[PDB]
Amino acid sequence: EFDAIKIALASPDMIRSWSFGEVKKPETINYRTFKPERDGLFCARIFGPVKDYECLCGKYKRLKHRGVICEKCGVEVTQTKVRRERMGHIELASPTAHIWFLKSLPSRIGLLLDMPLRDIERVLYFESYVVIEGGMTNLERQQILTEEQYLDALEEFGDEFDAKMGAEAIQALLKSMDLEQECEQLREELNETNSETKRKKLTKRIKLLEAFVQSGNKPEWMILTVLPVLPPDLRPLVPLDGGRFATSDLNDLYRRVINRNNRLKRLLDLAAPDIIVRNEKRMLQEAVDALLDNGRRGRAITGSNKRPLKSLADMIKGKQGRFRQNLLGKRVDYSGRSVITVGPYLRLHQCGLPKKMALELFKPFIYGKLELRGLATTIKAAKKMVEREEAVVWDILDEVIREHPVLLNRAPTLHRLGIQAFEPVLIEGKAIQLHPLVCAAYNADFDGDQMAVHVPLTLEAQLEARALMMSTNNILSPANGEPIIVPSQDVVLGLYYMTRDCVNAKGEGMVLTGPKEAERLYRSGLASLHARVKVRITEYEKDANGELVAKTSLKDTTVGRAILWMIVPKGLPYSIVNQALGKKAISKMLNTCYRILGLKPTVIFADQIMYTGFAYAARSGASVGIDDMVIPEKKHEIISEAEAEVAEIQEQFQSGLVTAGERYNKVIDIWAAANDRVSKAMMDNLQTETVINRDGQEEKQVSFNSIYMMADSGARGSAAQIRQLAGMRGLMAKPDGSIIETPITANFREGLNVLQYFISTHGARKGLADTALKTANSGYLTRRLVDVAQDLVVTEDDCGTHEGIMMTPVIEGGDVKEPLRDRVLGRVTAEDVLKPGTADILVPRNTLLHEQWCDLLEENSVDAVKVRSVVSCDTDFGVCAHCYGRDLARGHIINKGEAIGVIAAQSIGEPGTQLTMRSSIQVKNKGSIKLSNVKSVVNSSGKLVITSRNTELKLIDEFGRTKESYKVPYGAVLAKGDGEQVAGGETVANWDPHTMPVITEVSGFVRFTDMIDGQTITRQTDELTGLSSLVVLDSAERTAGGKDLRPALKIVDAQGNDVLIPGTDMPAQYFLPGKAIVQLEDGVQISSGDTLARIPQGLPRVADLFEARRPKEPAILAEISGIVSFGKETKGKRRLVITPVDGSDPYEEMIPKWRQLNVFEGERVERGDVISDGPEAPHDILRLRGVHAVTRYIVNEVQDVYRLQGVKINDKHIEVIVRQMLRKATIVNAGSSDFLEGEQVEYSRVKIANRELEANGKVGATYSRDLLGITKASLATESFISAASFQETTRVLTEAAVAGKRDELRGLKENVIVGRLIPAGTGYAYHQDRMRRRAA
Amino acid sequence: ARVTVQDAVEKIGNRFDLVLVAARRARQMQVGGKDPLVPEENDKTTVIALREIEEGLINNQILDVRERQEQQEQEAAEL
Amino acid sequence: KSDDVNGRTKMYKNIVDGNHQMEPGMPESFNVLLKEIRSLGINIELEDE
Amino acid sequence: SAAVKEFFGSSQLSQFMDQNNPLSEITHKRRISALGPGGLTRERAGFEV
Amino acid sequence: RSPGVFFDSDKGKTHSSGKVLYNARIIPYRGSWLDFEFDPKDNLFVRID
DNA sequence: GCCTTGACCCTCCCCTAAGGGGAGGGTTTAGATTGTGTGCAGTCTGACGCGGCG
DNA sequence: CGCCGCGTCAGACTCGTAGGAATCTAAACCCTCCCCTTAGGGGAGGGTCAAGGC
Ligand SMILES: [Mg+2]
Ligand SMILES: [Zn+2]
Ligand SMILES: [Zn+2]
């Protein structure tokens, strides 16, 4: 049909060619006989007939006369549907500026004219004149005149010059300007400029003028002289049920425009005084502005409610505009809704659908099969049969729903498992019966939740429901490869109770012929489910081939584990059930079944697990009583002891031994300790207090307490909640967040009193208000992520890149937060993985690291694997299937046509409602030590002194992999020789946290340089030290001289010889900053390593990381590598000069010195190391360290937020969003290219342009990749439709109109807007043969 | 009937291509006069198409050679 | 299912005839959108090549 | 008449009586609202109110 | 909110320096609001409505 | 069965005599009067563009 | 010309039933145009009913 959408400015002739007549009157319809009035806003002569195939006068009344325009009424005899398509126009009596091109910032009229919006608005409002042309006059072009200046220069310099006011003046200025001449003038002005602010000004204006030259647009079309009128059926005036009329606000706004325009024409006919005509022109301008965008300029016009009228711009923008309410999502037919209940009998692929719902949802199918089977002669006979609900329409309904899936949806659809397809089973209720195992995917409970049903109509939709969306395809999560159709609550409690063992249970110690004998003995009441017993078990294993070989042996098992073995599929080991099965063990059992045997055994296994767990949770009788909340018998004395401690601390505070701060902190500490004591006593009295007799002798076993069994199986409940049931509730926080110093010593088994309950509600309401207010923030973040990543699709199979990220385990301090195996599983290697035994290929170059390769990496010592990433994919407009890796929902490599961007955005945004809206080194374990980035010297006391700020300590095991990683401050003295064994708890590093020491260069003697005493020093004596110290104070502390001039502590030999560096002849001196305390004099020897001077020192976070927000005061990084020097101080901006050795030397910054610097004048810096400290800005990380550094930073900083709440997301999904944030590139040197310098282009565009330029031997452009947040990256897309539908619709449509953009509909949103197959999924083939039957 | 579609995805190596092949064959059976190549055990044409795909009787190349055979046969069978 | 006015009656008739195929056209709200962007001074247009 | 008619029929604080049971009715009558004309808006009411 | 004069501040949520800026607000039952406030440079500013 | 033929018949629209009734449109109106008149708001946080000081 | 505080702009969950908003306001003239009034008359346009003629 069409292949692109173009947007541009409309000329007056274009606007008159859309129209079918001029709207000349504000009449809508006759009040007596509601036919539309001629020449009005509803006019059948302009806009089309109001009855289908009938004129207005009734003279031509049938399709016999079609297309004939009546000569009496002028109405064309045609369909009335044309009243939705036929526009009109208003010929404006005065030129009126378009408010979008004036007032949507930056102003296009202002930027094109290079006038301030203050001067343009003064001319528009008839307050000032502007000189269109100066002539033989001293007046420059566009010079603004007040009225008196105009009347002076008019009589003084005659009518040689031309000066006007109003939008006729602005229009004459926009018409009189030469765009190409001004482009050349501005370009040669750019070639004369070094000021980067003015250079940005000029490149903005140049690309505006160039967009106007390249487009067909003319500047003067930004001033309206003709006004389009929307078709009247899109602004309908319709009679309501009670005879009242309902209208659009556009009729009010259009009527006001017509009324002020007709009065302006009248006044120009009467030759009114010009104060009246200027007023009418201002009123027509503000009426047209209110029609186009109501509320931008001035106060919003309200009509008859004091509610502002909805303008044309409000129709298409916002959450309730066309795009977001009607185009990006719709209300659909063949859709129902009901409360969901549980069906525990259902199979995983089926739902229960009420017969009353299905009879309506499937109604044309039933009509078709009633007429087809001869049971109805006519669709109306069939309709009456279905109304009467004859007994045969239920048979017809049972055969029309037979293999026909339905989609079930629960809002909010946070991820794609919120829509799943099921085969319906017709039930008799009114409630949908949902399978239990899918509820966790839906986040559904049966406490009043509703779900929507949708009927797939076409064969393709039915086969996508069956093949893509069916719940038996959805057992693995797409966020992480973990099972998402997983047992819970009742199932895991039944499977846990079944697989537990009692000590002296009935039937203990017999020997069973198999699991069938165990079931016989349990059912006949001769053995207990927990009787530990000896069963002959035959288990099958897969050999090297796909063959399944059996082994039979007597296992020491229980009766219930033998019973549970009967439902386990064959390729699985008996050790998978020979344990008590909690939630984790059952999830791992399902994952094991999936990886070993595949999907068909796994869905059968999951159904059998559900049935068995339900059955044996029923058999258990597992109740909850009040005697199950066993309160520890020593809780009262723990509380009495903490009360005695708090009383003695209170008496200490009365006796002045402690101030209120440490007093309060001591009370908080002795109550947190007593709470931990009560919790440990409660859990110890709860977890094993089955004491049981084995042949007379008492023995302890794990407890069959019901509260404990629910908590221990992972069914429901944490230890933190058993603490509130049976322990004490503990310390509560004020709404301030500060802890109330008297805790709830009660639990819920005992009562809380009124005061305890009140201070518990303090935090209960805070949590509930967080839940209520963070869904909006998480939805907004997910929407921004989808709209930044929607266009990313796996388009290629392999891009042949060799880049990638080096995956290592995440180690923060001395904990391994993320192992290598789950950071590298399902990813394609980027280089051959080698053993510690060198040059032997362990894993070849393009291997997808499935579980066997990961076990091979784990049994070897591989600590780092370089893998392929989407940020390093070479594919233009997409991603190859190898840089992505596995589809985590399938378990194999991703397919071409997968919308991995929507999956990534949903995977990140789904857990957002589980996030919150509001010194020395102690090595843990044994292993070798190695340090990195060390500036190391030997102290006089047998030490290692690491005088650096980039060093880090790493603890290696005998395996060879780093297990702990710390990093130590400047001048941290090492208690260890680096490179050999340490022990657990062994202190390796000690330093000063609160003060920064100065550590010397080489051994020698103190010498002084530029420290003129009395002006750079206060020599102060500390009364109990014996030797006085010398302070180098602030700059305002002393007079001119040493305040800015730096004291330099030289080191020389005692014979006066300056000591020279090993390797360089660099002069050994130490320049120290102000606020320093020195304890040294001249003459005393100092070896290398003496410390001479001491200078003393949730969900919003993820949203800030993806928006790439620069923090409040960032870290300061070294742009270029070199040596530090200092320029103009004593302004407030300390001037740092990094001096390279082989580059262009001067590079300065303006560091405000109210942040402590962490660099010295003698030490070098690498590009990007911290000069000052603070939260790093990701733009700086990208510029100075690169793309891999900023993606490493963003994935680590986002997974720190997610791992803290126990949320497991693959970092494929964060790398997808990071790749979509690195989509632009600013050109630094164009070469022989079509780009300017300092111009932001797409990275793929400049990469393709360089591919073509180095294909023709010429030099391509050089660029610097930008980092944009997810809002600025999704607003900077090459598609104006998706950007305008995301947000800021006015800005997007304004820049797209003045630039003359064209949208080729290449992403998912633009094909959703326009009702096409998306270019992903099963529409990927269609778009491929749409583009190869267009490029041919 | 059809519970899991995994066996048909192995033959037609994509889930996205499987839907297209199966919908082409299911439309041949539904509105064309084509009879199933498998015993129709009270299945709908979508499930019959999936059961033919999972038996190797239908793929995109088989559907292509079948339509080319029918097209050349019926364009040749007139004077 | 929602906005294609000619296509939804064709779809109903196709379901009644046992032919589960759609002939999808343009959503009517996209035509409303195009007419509302043109009621601003903006020439938005489908490039029908 | 219009001022008091607008208050009693159209205010945000003039609410359709919750008449499920006796507890609904006396809970509705003993209700305090920060919203309404001269009060807060539920969209810009922060965490601390 | 009751009518009267209320003394409040922002606690370091301005001027990027953690400086607390105080304000006073006279709220009538009916009439214009009268706000005094401190800028980050300790000048007193009146603000009406 | 096909085809005419003369006589009937129907509704629908316009006409009657002397204006009645009403709808919908114009026009002037001569003591003197000379600046509206409401609110409402307990958002925060980014982010961009600009006067104004240095 | 470069930087800092100020003005401004743009974003911020889907089911059932209730469910809106409620003020304010010429008169006396004149004109044309359209429909209306009895008790049916006249005609145009389009159908219908028995006769037969082949
Ligand atoms: Mg619920
Ligand atoms: Zn007509
Ligand atoms: Zn790639």
Curated annotation (Swiss-Prot), chain A:
GO terms for cellular component: DNA-directed RNA polymerase complex. It holds the Pfam family RNA_pol_Rpb1_1. Keywords: Acetylation, DNA-directed RNA polymerase, Magnesium, Metal-binding, Nucleotidyltransferase, Transcription, Transferase, Zinc. InterPro entries: DNA-dir_RpoC_beta_prime, DNA-dir_RpoC_beta_prime_bact, RNA_pol_asu, RNA_pol_N, RNA_pol_Rpb1_1, RNA_pol_Rpb1_3, RNA_pol_Rpb1_3_sf, RNA_pol_Rpb1_4. Its EC number is 2.7.7.6. Its cofactor is Mg(2+); Zn(2+). The keyword Aminoacyl-tRNA synthetase does not apply. One of its GO terms (biological process) is DNA-templated transcription. The keyword Ligase does not apply. Binds 1 Mg(2+) ion per subunit. Zn(2+) 2 binds at residues 799, 873, 880, 883. SMART domains: RPOLA_N. GO terms for molecular function: DNA binding; DNA-directed RNA polymerase activity; magnesium ion binding; zinc ion binding. Mg(2+) binds at residues 445, 447, 449. The RNAP catalytic core consists of 2 alpha, 1 beta, 1 beta' and 1 omega subunit. When a sigma factor is associated with the core the holoenzyme is formed, which can initiate transcription. Belongs to the RNA polymerase beta' chain family. DNA-dependent RNA polymerase catalyzes the transcription of DNA into RNA using the four ribonucleoside triphosphates as substrates. PANTHER family: DNA-DIRECTED RNA POLYMERASE, DNA-DIRECTED RNA POLYMERASE SUBUNIT BETA. This is DNA-directed RNA polymerase subunit beta'.
Swiss-Prot record, chain B:
PANTHER family: DNA-DIRECTED RNA POLYMERASE SUBUNIT OMEGA (PTHR34476:SF1). One of its GO terms (cellular component) is DNA-directed RNA polymerase complex. Its EC number is 2.7.7.6. InterPro entries: DNA-dir_RNA_pol_omega, Pol_omega/Rpo6/RPB6, RPB6/omega-like_sf. Keywords: DNA-directed RNA polymerase, Nucleotidyltransferase, Transcription, Transferase. It catalyses: RNA(n) + a ribonucleoside 5'-triphosphate = RNA(n+1) + diphosphate. It comes from the Bacteria. It holds the Pfam family RNA_pol_Rpb6. This is DNA-directed RNA polymerase subunit omega. The lineage of its organism: Bacteria, Pseudomonadati, Pseudomonadota, Gammaproteobacteria, Enterobacterales. The RNAP catalytic core consists of 2 alpha, 1 beta, 1 beta' and 1 omega subunit. When a sigma factor is associated with the core the holoenzyme is formed, which can initiate transcription. GO terms for biological process: DNA-templated transcription. Disulfide bonds: none annotated. Promotes RNA polymerase assembly. Latches the N- and C-terminal regions of the beta' subunit thereby facilitating its interaction with the beta and alpha subunits. Belongs to the RNA polymerase subunit omega family. The gene is rpoZ. It is an enzyme of class 2 (transferase). GO terms for molecular function: DNA binding; DNA-directed RNA polymerase activity. Coiled coil: none annotated.
Curated annotation (Swiss-Prot), chain E:
Belongs to the RNA polymerase beta chain family. DNA-dependent RNA polymerase catalyzes the transcription of DNA into RNA using the four ribonucleoside triphosphates as substrates. Transmembrane segments: none annotated. The chain holds residues 151 to 199 of 1342 of the full protein. The RNAP catalytic core consists of 2 alpha, 1 beta, 1 beta' and 1 omega subunit. When a sigma factor is associated with the core the holoenzyme is formed, which can initiate transcription. This is DNA-directed RNA polymerase subunit beta.
